[PDB]
Amino acid sequence: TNSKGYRRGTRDMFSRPFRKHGVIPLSTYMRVFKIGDIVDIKGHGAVQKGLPYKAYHGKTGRIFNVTQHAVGVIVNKRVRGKILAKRVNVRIEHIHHSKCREDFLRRVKENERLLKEAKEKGQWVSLKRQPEQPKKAHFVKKLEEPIALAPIPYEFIA
């Protein structure tokens, strides 16, 4: 009967990776964080100041604040069963940029590049994503060394 307290169970959460110990690379402090930016939390065990508490590791929020060393990130925690949006002041070394939306934003960049040159053709602009449709009718040619090439089900004996 514990969780309680504050870095418990984080023997593997705030560990370092293997041979990624030591000095922090310098671009970690050279990243720019503007208000309203999507941001993951993966805490740094080698920076003992401004670590998020363990519920928020692995999560994802939006930057609501910038101060001199940290960003306020607003993160969702399910406190059962309901979702509060938690405001967590977290230092910059524990904070990353989300890649999730900058491969949505390279489609807004193409839902206006492809609708641009569609002023000549007209249609279909085809600006929606399609799931993996079932395949087609297609003519598999053999030739290729005609078949059989015939498996039979056999591997036991030892």
Added chain:
Amino acid sequence: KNKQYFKRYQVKFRRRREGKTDYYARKRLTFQDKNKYNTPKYRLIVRLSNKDITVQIAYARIEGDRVVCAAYSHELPKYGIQVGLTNYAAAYCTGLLVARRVLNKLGLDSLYAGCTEVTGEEFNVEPVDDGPGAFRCFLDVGLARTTTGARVFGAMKGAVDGGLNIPHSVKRFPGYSAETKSFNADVHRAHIFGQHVADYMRSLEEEDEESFKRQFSRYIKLGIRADDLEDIYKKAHQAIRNDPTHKVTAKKSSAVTKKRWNAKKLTNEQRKTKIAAHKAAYVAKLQSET
């Protein structure tokens, strides 16, 4: 040591493996705030050598520092100083050369002239009104030992004489004693104009006159006498204040394919034929057993 701490071996970065960077200071020199979002900070980098003084202005960007102004000591022959390129005196020129090199291209030489009245006092430029102040640098010394009177502090007073706003204290200027401070501009003024290099070569024709052919050689070749240095450096402090034009050269265009020497390394077909005859002629040599 044998295959198994090599597996667990984590190198240091690349430059701390090679002595170049602190990274405990590089972390703290290149610190910008996060609510100062992408503003550069432009530190002042004077690195010494044996026969060069590289002064630079670089700002912290991710894919490398970007160098915005670079004045060396191997160009001060163009301004009237032929030898003694790594002086305490010859740094204040490259200090002052890199400040006037950057305020003309930033247009900030009409305002922020500087200190041509070179005295050795503490000099902190008050901001010219109708707007904020001047270009700020911060001094980046590396791991030069910052004891009082080093030549690395001989480019901070050179650059602050051009007019740049680099934050100060005179504690490490040559001629400010340690009990107390005891400001004394005159030993700083002596060192600025190269007096105590002149005084040593005015004290060496009294003790050991043969040692001119030793230390302070090539003053004998180029004819620089000891009473000239207080006016060699003085007339250089306006010939530098009149032509800071970056020394840009145009070979046009001889950098790539020069001309003959690509230095290929043993394409793996050769290495597998290198150990074709290395293996075949060994057992033929072992057929000279029988």
Added chain:
Amino acid sequence: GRRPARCYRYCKNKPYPKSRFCRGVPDPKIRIFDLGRKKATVEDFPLCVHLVSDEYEQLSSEALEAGRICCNKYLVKYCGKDQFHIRMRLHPFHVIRINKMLSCAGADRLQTGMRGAFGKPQGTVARVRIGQPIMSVRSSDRYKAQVIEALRRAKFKFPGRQKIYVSKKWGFTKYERERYEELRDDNRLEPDGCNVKYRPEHGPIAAWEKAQRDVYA
């Protein structure tokens, strides 16, 4: 009090070791794992024969101790004194505890009736898996029939069921007998006691001519 493994037959739990965290673990009275001519070379004993578990049992230390002696005493009686190497490949680092209830004098009431349960380590056992060997005897091919009966006599002292496999290997090395014979027929099998050394192309080259200076000379 050495109660047998007769009623142990749901075994559940992650292996508690004899480590720096339950210190008080005893010296084992079951120590030796291998016997016979254990100084024989690779070339002496071509035949390997295993006793292989086709269940998921929990073989006891006293079961494994008993089964080695019955495999020993038949082989030193029939196929020669030192024509075998028995390797008992199940080293039992397990802790089975016991809640002992010191209930002498019938009156004390203090220690444990059902509250509370710290244990005391008495057992030591080996998990086997399907297809996983239990002991391998290495001997010649003249005594192939004498080998299997000593493993048969060891079967009836283990729980579960077990299958006696003549392996097609050449000894305890992980080679086919043909692939052992081909690879030893040029240079590449540089022998040791139990095992050979393998097929070296690396590194760097100094131990290639040392082979070639000892294939010709």
Added chain:
Amino acid sequence: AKSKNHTNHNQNKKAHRNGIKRPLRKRHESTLGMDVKFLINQRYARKGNLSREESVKRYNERIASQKGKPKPVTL
């Protein structure tokens, strides 16, 4: 007599009924616990917008009277 404490049984049936409830999406989220020197006369970066188009596209040529600030902003 000491019966049965602690279970998360029924606790997600019972928490999925009135459902598991995202907060709600606002156009105006609060500025509180935010950097106060970022806010305190950016209150007056709003209050300096006395006009925004009439007197303001006058300014595009009022500073192009001095040809803008095209060079010296480059430090």
Added chain:
Amino acid sequence: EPYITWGYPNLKSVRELIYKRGFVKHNRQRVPITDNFVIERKLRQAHQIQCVEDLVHEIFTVGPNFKYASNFLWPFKLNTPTGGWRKKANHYVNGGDFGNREDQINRLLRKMV
């Protein structure tokens, strides 16, 4: 999967389910068919469906208004098979029922329609 069987309908199975069993959704209510005006009054201004064979077309050949052609319908409240089932809790490929029957959804719709 274990609560469901599916497969790939014929044209005849598309028709017989909409002819015999096809009901339709009219302002949240369930309205049988009985004429083409129940299909046309809700899918001809927006989509181009007025007949029954319209609704059989853009369901069978999966057309661009399939989303509307199949949410217009109510779920087909089928009968029970004649001869009944096979096991109901094994896969079709085990010994029979749930999952993809794949062409044998037709034979089972003859029993249910």
Added chain:
Amino acid sequence: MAAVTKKIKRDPAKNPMRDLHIRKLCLNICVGESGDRLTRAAKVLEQLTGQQPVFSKARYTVRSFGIRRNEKIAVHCTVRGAKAEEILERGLKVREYELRRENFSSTGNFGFGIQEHIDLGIKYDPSIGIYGLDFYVVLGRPGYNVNHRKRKSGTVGFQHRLTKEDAMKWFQQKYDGIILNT
């Protein structure tokens, strides 16, 4: 091995810049325990060297010699460069320059020890007492400050780095000693 070397020889790779001079000489007096005995032992080296020496403290406790943590047992100093060649050869003819064989480290330094400290041109002077000393001669070529600078450091390599058998080679020539195979 037999990797191709190709050995381009524009000059025979001799050693003008590879001097194998004396770096420094280490002079220790490991007195047993503290008190005023080190003070009268420390002043024998300002007589010998001129530099005032340093008071090395004992690291561990032993209870067998009587030393503890920080009990100031020894006195040492170091002499570097052409002033060692006073105190080297002045204490080497005491050892009658012919010296033992090991006595010669694999690291290239070598050293010896003499008792009877008044054979260094020192008058006997019973106000201080006689002492036994510890002479260690570290030895090196130019470029050995490559690992000593704080900025842009490095390591010396194989050649240069001088063996035992080139300190002996330096000793059969300078002072003309014999190596005394014992």
Added chain:
RNA sequence: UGUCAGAAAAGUUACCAUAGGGAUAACUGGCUUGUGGCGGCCAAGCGUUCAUAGCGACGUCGCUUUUUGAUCCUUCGAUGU
């Protein structure tokens, strides 16, 4: 203010009382069997000689709750121990 969201607090009752409790012991009944014993395999060996006439080590697989624990399910408006 450690009973740590924080009364100011020693026993005994076989002379006993009350409200309840099978949310809770004492015995029966149930499940359980570590403990005892009764079986079957393998055979080191004992038995002058002979492995099983009679035995039978180290192992091994079961049966047996009744002693005996463990348990708290039924009964405390009472199942006579």
Added chain:
RNA sequence: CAAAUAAUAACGGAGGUGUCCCAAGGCCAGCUCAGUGCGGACAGAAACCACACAUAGAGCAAAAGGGCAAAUGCUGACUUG
């Protein structure tokens, strides 16, 4: 334990707390630790001096865990955030 987010029980298992600290806090600078090898009179298994290797195998009031090498370790400088 705990079943790869967090949560999670038993009189489950292994321990720790009720303190210590004018430095063991703050910060700059210099420095490299465990051990190992070849050496140097008394001096040995260890005393000290000195060279070479040392991925932290040391040390950090820390119970365990994480973390840390021109440091958060060792030494000095001023210091009281």
Added chain:
RNA sequence: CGAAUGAUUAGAGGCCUUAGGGUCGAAACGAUCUUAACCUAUUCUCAAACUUUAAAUGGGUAAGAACCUUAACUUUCUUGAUAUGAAGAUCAAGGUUAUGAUAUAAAUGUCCCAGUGGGCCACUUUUGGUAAGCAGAACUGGCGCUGUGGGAUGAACCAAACGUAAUGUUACGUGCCCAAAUUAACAACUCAUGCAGAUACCAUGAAAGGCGUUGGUUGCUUAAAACAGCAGGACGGUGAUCAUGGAAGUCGAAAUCCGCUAAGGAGUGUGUAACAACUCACCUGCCGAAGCAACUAGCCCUUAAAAUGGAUGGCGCUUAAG
């Protein structure tokens, strides 16, 4: 686990100068090195409080007017020497709202509204405990709170949730109880002398066997005449020795070498005190066709012992009604 930390098993190659002393030698270095240390290439087996690696099922976020690119304004706080930053406030320009499927109507307040705050069962994962119809947890589904169909019976299992009716169609079943097959449907398996066997959960039964029968895998002999049987020898070159219960063809047994041909065993034996013979090999027969073992897993048997009389639910079934 031929990576660290912890274990742990065996050898192999060696630095050596650690020897535990050796060995041929007073110690020897004049040689074998003897072994054990130490080093190096391997090796067996492993970890609730180890881990380079690393799933499945999971956790979070995103998937557009609340948007995307502009233009130039505001700012003291805001930063910059920039009233280009960074936030904000405006005008400009932008085909087809930017996966799928759904919409039981969703949103939001108030009575902080009543009851509740003993739970219990199950798959899977789990801890304690020898075990438990025991103790404690995670997950989802259930009983509580719920009838009805099936499991004879039954809180929970399988199916299915329920207005009042008519008709038709459905997992468990179809010898009789009892609705529906003693199936104009089959192929096999099995004989059980005191519970043959008979539907999940589930109402127990093992290890190990069977020249009981059924199928199967491996190896020999074979159409050179085997297999079986009626028909021959089996003594000995010799109590070599081992040996006196005693080994003369034989307990044990270091040891191990010999008859003859068509063809005979220093030979296993209760103990034939020690001897004899004898006969399961060899091989000439007749026979003249398949024989031999070893192994495997179906059913049945065996292993298999309780107390009122008794339970596949009952009857009863045996080319089944298992």
Added chain:
RNA sequence: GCCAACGACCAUACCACGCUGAAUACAUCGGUUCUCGUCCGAUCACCGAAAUUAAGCAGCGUCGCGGGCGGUUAGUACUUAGAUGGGGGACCGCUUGGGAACACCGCGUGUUGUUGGCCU
């Protein structure tokens, strides 16, 4: 082809050796009056010029170690979901998807940014 200062990623860059090296450089190097610091001008600080096969980033070489990427292990191990499946149990088969790891073999052995120069 390179050289330097400042870097980013932080072993494809490391480690062990071996062998080259034009030119700018970078060094080692010389000295202690000055500023500065040591027990010591070795280190640090400062003045600044008399010889090169050590640093240095390399040019590299290595059937190199490590590290890196691919292949193969392997549709293997495990695992989602299912059954009135099996078995006395332990556990195992199949259905429905998902899908590793060591090793093993092969491959390559820093990539580049800004600013100043050199041209074999």
